[PDB]
């Protein structure tokens, strides 16, 4: 875990303090705009449930993926920036995102 954004943020957000998580996606949009996706395009989740929603527009995201040499305690990530549609599973009241299903 070093200075690239992925190594830094994964550690800061308590994802890699006690393990190395293989992949994680960060969304660079306002919280309310991401929560707004729960009332957008309803789609089926990969698991078949129907509480998933796809964003009308693409969103700024950063994909973090472990390199093939990464090993606890020295997790290492490859950082990839992209703009894509996000698909989230929503639940509760208020109806908010609880899982990131995919990115298109």
């Amino acid at each position: 875990s070093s200075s690239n954004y992925c190594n830094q943020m994964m550690k800061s957000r308590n994802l890699t303090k006690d393990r190395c998580k293989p992949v994680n996606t960060f969304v660079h949009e306002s919280l309310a705009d991401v929560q707004a996706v729960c009332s957008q395009k309803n789609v089926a989740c990969k698991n078949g449930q129907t509480n998933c929603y796809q964003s009308y527009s693409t969103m700024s995201i950063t994909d973090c993926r472990e390199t093939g040499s990464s090993k606890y305690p020295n997790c290492a990530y490859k950082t990839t920036q992209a703009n894509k549609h996000i698909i989230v599973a929503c639940e509760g009241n208020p109806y908010v995102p609880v899982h990131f299903d995919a990115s298109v």
């Binding site: 308590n14 969304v27 991401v34 950063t62 639940e91």
Partner: peptide
């Protein structure tokens, strides 16, 4: 403790 919504935010949101 941490709710599922809170966890989603800590793990995926970077406004």
């Amino acid at each position: 403790k941490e709710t599922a919504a809170a966890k989603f935010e800590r793990q995926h949101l970077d406004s």
